[model samples]
Target: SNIPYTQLDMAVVQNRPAGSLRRFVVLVVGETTRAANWGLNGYSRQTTPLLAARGDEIVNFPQVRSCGTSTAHSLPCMFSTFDRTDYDEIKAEHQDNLLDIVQRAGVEVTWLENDSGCKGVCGKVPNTDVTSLNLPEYCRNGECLDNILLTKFDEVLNKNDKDAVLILHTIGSHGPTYYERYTEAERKFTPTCDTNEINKCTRATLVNTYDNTVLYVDQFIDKVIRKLENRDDLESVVHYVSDHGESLGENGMYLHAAPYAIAPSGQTHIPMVMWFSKAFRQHGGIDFQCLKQKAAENEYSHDHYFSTVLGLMDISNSQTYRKEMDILAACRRP
Candidate 1:
């Protein structure tokens, strides 16, 4: 048989528990975000003011690393059962991903992407290409800012009548052209590099420009969380992770895509954050104290994503799911 690409109506491989409350997860996947560059992760700059303000409500993972060095490699592996060590692109194209499993189990899934694509993860799901949106404040030089994804997000949620998963794939900090990712208000850091030639700018200028983009990302996620909070009918959660990390003038490297074995930590170490609503914690039987204890221990990677999503959705009956890969498995209540 050919690799099982996601079909809308597949044989039910799993089912949510009877009487389980409806859940909604807003997964925001950023591009080229380095874990340490974020303010919550202890970077020197206040690049993540929004997330920083909501620090107590969210759980931040400090030692999270990417499975690959670039979006092309990482996004696929992030949603796959395989890790970067033995990843195969062709095989990934044929395999069912987290979205596939969630959809098969009767949850509604949608992908709103501002980047090139979801790397085939949303192949069988309803997908929107958001880069084409023309907004005066968020769109500049024909490219829409990450804020555009939030424009009608609430409307999308209202339209879904079932347990839902919304994926927002951002054009986050994908540079050389870091200056273009954010607007003038977000350019708090001075002497920013405005040129695509990242090497031409001083390291300070390059970093300033990059961090500004992250500031915008911080704003976008905060906006998403605020929207999710207003939806009283849904038990919501927000999970933000980068597809991969970037190297800005570190060891003379400009962008991502370095070989995984030789890639610098700047290109492998990624940031991940989770904000669970009171409803999600109770419905999923998740203990925030236990989650905080796990976060304190910190070591995690993209390998945890697939099974973790299953855990977050409480899709425990899936024969394909692995307990060890589910980060929250230990933290869930009996």
Candidate 2:
């Protein structure tokens, strides 16, 4: 017990106790989003009403490079393999993940998504959770909207699984038809909406539509948080990051699916944020204040995300876990 190890030694030691704190961690993953298009990152549109209202309650990391440019290529790399940088050796085969490590440590794992991609990753985990929504009727036209794919939070909480890890994957400003991604009210700014990832269009239109979708995502996230705030069986922490980014006609790239090396900021530099309740903080034994500030200042990476969650869940000896790399401050101190 006297051995000097990092992260979890002082507060979370094996055989001692599991601690009195209960915890909940939610991974709010979005698809085909661009950092510049969100209002929180200054898109010049009122697209993030819910996120904006939270203020310092949420911290946005303005510069995060995704492992790939498409969901099929990126999600597995990010969630299963620790981070995208090591995605090349798909054969390397690391058997555990952030969710798996936590679950093995007694945390219940629940995966919730609006897209099918996450289902592929959760295939091996028995406790995984799943959900999906139909695409809008007119997605090819400029009439399709993101709000069409909304999921239910009330039912997820009522299911009786309390110590859980909930996930959400949304179809955000995936483009070619920007107007279809958001509602009319969200399309307030202009030069707005684009038809293709390449070719000519008003930059404002494309940006406006993307921002509008982001605004809705923000509100949707807040709604989930409000509901979790009251649950006693669980304490909550919400983490948001994009699977890959989109390029809105920059140098001729339209949507994502391109090689990462050539992808533009629109397809790489993504936005991220975290929100946790007081009960969650106490249980995880973390104070995210400094980490939040660093993330806002653009000082974190995808590498830290995998580790941060396990650290917060009070798990031990993760195969790829590195204490120095955990960016979420609450998990940094032992």
Candidate 3:
């Protein structure tokens, strides 16, 4: 409510069409995950075994480029009310982000953070930094596993009056401490780099450690989807996109944040995945098959996020809402 768009927000609220189906969108923000290593995106390894099995229900946007090569740049730029071509961090800092606009549209917005990468996007909303909770098994050294973000799912899933959006911030495949990101039981790869000195580790071992992080992310998202399956009362969806990608010893480059231009393909080509409940598909008028086809056609970017999110939440035809930018808009049946 602190910006010029406050009026636009009210206008959207006034013109919002009637809808009875309440929606629960669980938007997962993954960090440093690349398309090259994702199983659904043609990776040779089973890094995403759990999600791969549910391929029919998940839409994998295989070719997505990030806004920038760092969290501070990518996270904020993606959620800002601006597109990449004209986006400036200073200008966006003062502008009201989507959550406020969305909250004004009468939806409950909650953000759960495990990655510490929201970059002020969730500052105005009701948000919980799970790492701060220090919940014994989930938190360590002021950092919590992504699974910690889901611990309180019952709070929102049990019942709700308004449509809701829960943003889950994850430390997915972020290095060079990848081995610390997941548990031993969740380790799908062998001889992972066990230290923060990742560059010293063998490239194969470093990659194994990194893939293990994605494996855990796969398991975490699967668990989220499974929990929402029986919630017939609400339309639930789990949409995940990484902030940026990583360079694992590719051409001697290591880690992310290597200036956007001249950045390795490994640092820009990220992964985006979406899974919708049957209830949401029918009620929200989305043709899953069409969405799947669209995801395969072209490369997408953070530029699509601000508007696509609004469209997914069932808000449309208003100021600041761009139908053309919505990756799923064409797939929605009237």
Candidate 4:
């Protein structure tokens, strides 16, 4: 076990009404993972067991696409207001992001990340960044597996306030070092373990490593939810969205960072999952049963995500927040 498996250092020592004053949410951002490889999205492997076991408690976005194909462009676009609809203008604005809006509205924003991007955002928002995010001794190619980011969620939750937006940035399938992504012990399904993400390795190998990375993602997510299951100060909402998707030998493309409109589904059709806690369900007025069904059926988009999150947190001041674009809102049945 890469994690210590100790009782998580939970900070929600007291229970407030699930509907006290506001809501709390976390955005799980994965890097360079393609949707086509996710088991929840019909991939072959049981890659997303954590998300799968939760069933309809999640809002799965099927046609969710990104504004760009690289982390720098896509992440900036995701946090900012830039989307396919207003690309030219949103990019030109060069404004702050969702964290800024959420913080300005008195919502506590804390970034629990394993990437440099979080540092960038922390620099922008009046937020706190925990340095003790690395996990139990795990190594890769002479290093302590410099990319295992799944173990940091618990580290952050243990120190965060109730009304907080914990942004977890993971090294999901950021490959080329596919063989080293997961712990050495879990390698079973063989004949496909490759160290590179390009022509040097078989497509199957690249995908196998990618799928395994998803499994790791699922495990880490499962643990995070379990830790929050017993909390009350704030209803926990876990959402997984990628900065951008990957290519994986599609249409002569070995990776992402291509031109947006020309990007393949694997690069633009990013995977997103929203798992809301029971209190979150009650307070957000979300129908877990329905959300799960829709998510499983792959029926949502990023357009409404901007507003869905705002609605969950009761954030109504941002000019970028939209009501009509709330994916879960539109998914709800009458």
TM-scores, one per candidate = 0.93, 0.80, 0.94, 0.80
Q: Which candidate comes out best when scored by TM-score?
A: 3
lDDT of 3 by residue, 1-334 (tens): 3544333455455232475667888888899988899999889998888888886888998889899999999988998778877887777877678887888777788888888657888988888777888887877677778787778877866546678888888887877778878997678888889999987889999988989998888888999998888778778888899998999998989999998878999999998999888788767778888888899997899999988889877774457888888998899876
Off by over 4 Å in 2: 1-19, 92-94, 126-151, 190-201, 329-332
Candidate 4, 262-324: lDDT as tens digits: 777888777887777777766666566666565556544444455666666655435666656
lDDT (Cα atoms) of all candidates against the true structure: 0.83, 0.62, 0.83, 0.63
lDDT of 1: 0.83
Candidate 3's TM-score reads 0.94
**CA RMSD of each candidate after superposition:** 2.2, 6.2, 2.2, 8.5
**Higher-scoring candidate on TM-score, 1 or 3:** 3
Model 2 Cα shift for residue 137 (angstroms): 11
lDDT of 4: 0.63
